[PDB]
Ligand binder design. Structure first.
Ligand SMILES: COC(=O)[C@@H](C)CO[C@@H]1O[C@H](CO)[C@@H](O)[C@H](O)[C@H]1NC(C)=O
Length: 512
């Protein structure tokens, strides 16, 4: 695809991907690059840094404030009052001022902008956090935290209970808890009233309380999370913790009857001798239609349709794609048509894996389900490719250096036989070193380096009262933490569907 051809295509991740391929091969001239950012669907990351090597972006300073950015720390007292307050939006700018000017500016702004006054006088002390905390200036607290994660201080009950009302709180709590940073902040957060938090924040505060062995406080947080979570899967995760802590058998019963299929509801069903959940059976009689399952642009276009279709238009699409060759699109449509209440666990292109042993089949299928929902031309925001979502670098290493496939191109990852074959090859590498499918999943998504570093810690996946469940909440990258839980559930299901059942209790035992 020439850049001219691509510019005819609708903006999409597939068009971004192929523009990116031209950039990395140095095929986009400075002239081609002029109008190019209007042709880019997601102007973030590698494509943006590659385009900017060709055409740096001067943008952007709001022309209303342009003159404000002609002052420096040395001339800010010459600026009019509007420019002074605009430049004081930056804590680095405040930090660069000399202390005499911070005092002057603090008086200037005490009436109309006491938030600025607080930060200015705070930076005249040796610990701006301590000054802002004594003022209980909540906006200033989060500005300081965003400026530097190194500040750490005990926070009293009044202060910590004000923090959750600020939009920054959820990410703040999540980061310091799963990174095990800012221990004085973490310990202080034990005194947040569960009434003042909800959803993810309540849940992480439960995890925090567990790490300090405050199990009653943890129960109260997890109960509040269970009551407020929007998604049933997260609600189940919180009810599982209520059960593990206080052992109320009504909680476990509720978990076992969940409509969400996840590791917690699966485990509760196992503990209560409840039958395995119902898995839909999709077997279209019609063998084909006209859709090219190997055209990445066609997928982007039909995906946008499906995602924007009303309840009625899904019906037309479901019928059109109810074929064997478009089985992955069919199940994709059904999963939205049925408002996510039915469990679809398809096994498309099964000939390519039927000769692997059942357990390997399930791991491959479990990864593919989470990575792509089996869409052959799937492309992630980071241009991971195909059913198994291989990054181009690893795809080329395997296909060119290891397997020496003639005329290999990274787009071969869009071919199911290649995706499954490379997936098996890489999963062999990972499983040989890590054994557990959960650890393999973490390493597949996050790399074996991060996984080895996690598993080397004294406080991860070792023996313990609430292990291995607690460790699974403390996996230090959110994407991998979530990914492992989902792939593990898929793995259990596929092993069941393949007549090679394993109890998830055995899986959890082998994590320790
Ligand atoms: C947008 O969401 C989807 O289409 C779902 C299939 C989930 O997306 C997948 O999420 C994984 C991490 O959990 C990434 O590793 C995958 O690359 C990523 N696939 C894609 C195609 O973006």
């Amino acid at each position: 695809y020439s850049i001219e051809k691509l510019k005819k295509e609708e903006n999409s991740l597939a068009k971004d991907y192929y523009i990116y391929r031209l950039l990395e091969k140095n095929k986009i001239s400075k002239k081609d690059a002029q109008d190019l950012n209007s042709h880019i669907f997601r102007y973030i990351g590698k494509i943006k840094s590659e385009l900017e090597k060709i055409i740096p972006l001067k943008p952007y300073i709001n022309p209303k404030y342009a003159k404000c950015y002609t002052y420096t720390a040395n001339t800010i007292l010459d600026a009019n009052l509007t420019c002074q307050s605009v430049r004081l939006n930056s804590l680095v700018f405040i930090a660069s001022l000399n202390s005499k000017d911070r005092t002057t500016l603090a008086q200037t702004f005490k009436n109309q902008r006491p938030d600025l006054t607080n930060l200015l006088l705070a930076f005249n002390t040796s610990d701006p956090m301590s000054y802002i905390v004594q003022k209980e200036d909540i906006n200033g607290f989060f500005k300081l935290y965003n400026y530097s994660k190194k500040y750490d201080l005990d926070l009293n009950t009044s202060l910590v209970n004000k923090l959750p009302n600020h939009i920054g709180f959820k990410d703040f709590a999540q980061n310091i808890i799963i990174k095990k940073e800012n221990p004085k902040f973490r310990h202080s957060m034990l005194e947040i009233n569960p009434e003042n938090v909800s959803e993810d924040s309540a849940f992480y505060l439960g995890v925090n309380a567990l790490t300090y062995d405050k199990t009653e406080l943890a129960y109260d947080f997890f109960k509040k999370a269970a009551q407020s979570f929007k998604s049933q899967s997260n609600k189940d995760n919180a009810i599982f913790w209520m059960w593990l802590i206080k052992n109320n058998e009504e909680d476990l019963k509720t978990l076992s009857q969940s409509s969400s299929l996840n590791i917690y509801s699966l485990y509760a069903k196992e503990l209560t001798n409840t039958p395995f959940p119902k898995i839909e059976s999709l077997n279209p009689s019609k063998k084909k239609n006209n859709f090219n399952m190997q055209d990445p642009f066609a997928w982007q276009k039909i995906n946008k349709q499906i995602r924007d279709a009303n309840a009625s238009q899904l019906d037309v699409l479901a019928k059109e794609f109810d074929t064997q060759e478009t089985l992955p699109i069919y199940a994709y449509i059904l999963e939205r048509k049925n408002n996510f209440k039915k469990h679809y666990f398809i096994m498309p292109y099964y000939d390519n894996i039927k000769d692997y042993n059942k357990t390997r089949q399930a791991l491959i299928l479990a990864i593919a389900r989470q990575e792509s929902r089996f869409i052959p031309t799937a492309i992630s925001v980071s241009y991971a490719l195909g059913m198994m979502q291989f990054m181009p670098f690893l795809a080329n290493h395997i296909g060119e250096k290891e397997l020496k496939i003639p005329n290999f191109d990274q787009d071969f990852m869009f071919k199911p036989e290649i995706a499954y074959y490379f997936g098996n090859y890489h999963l062999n590498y990972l499983e040989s070193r890590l054994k557990s499918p959960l650890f393999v999943a973490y390493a597949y998504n996050g790399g074996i380096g991060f996984t080895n570093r996690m598993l080397a810690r004294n406080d991860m996946f070792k023996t313990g009262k609430f292990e291995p469940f607690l460790s699974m909440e403390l996996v230090p990258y959110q994407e991998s933490r979530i990914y492992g839980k989902k792939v593990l559930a898929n793995y259990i299901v596929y092993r069941h569907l393949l007549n090679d059942s394993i109890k998830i209790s055995d899986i959890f035992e082998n994590l320790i």
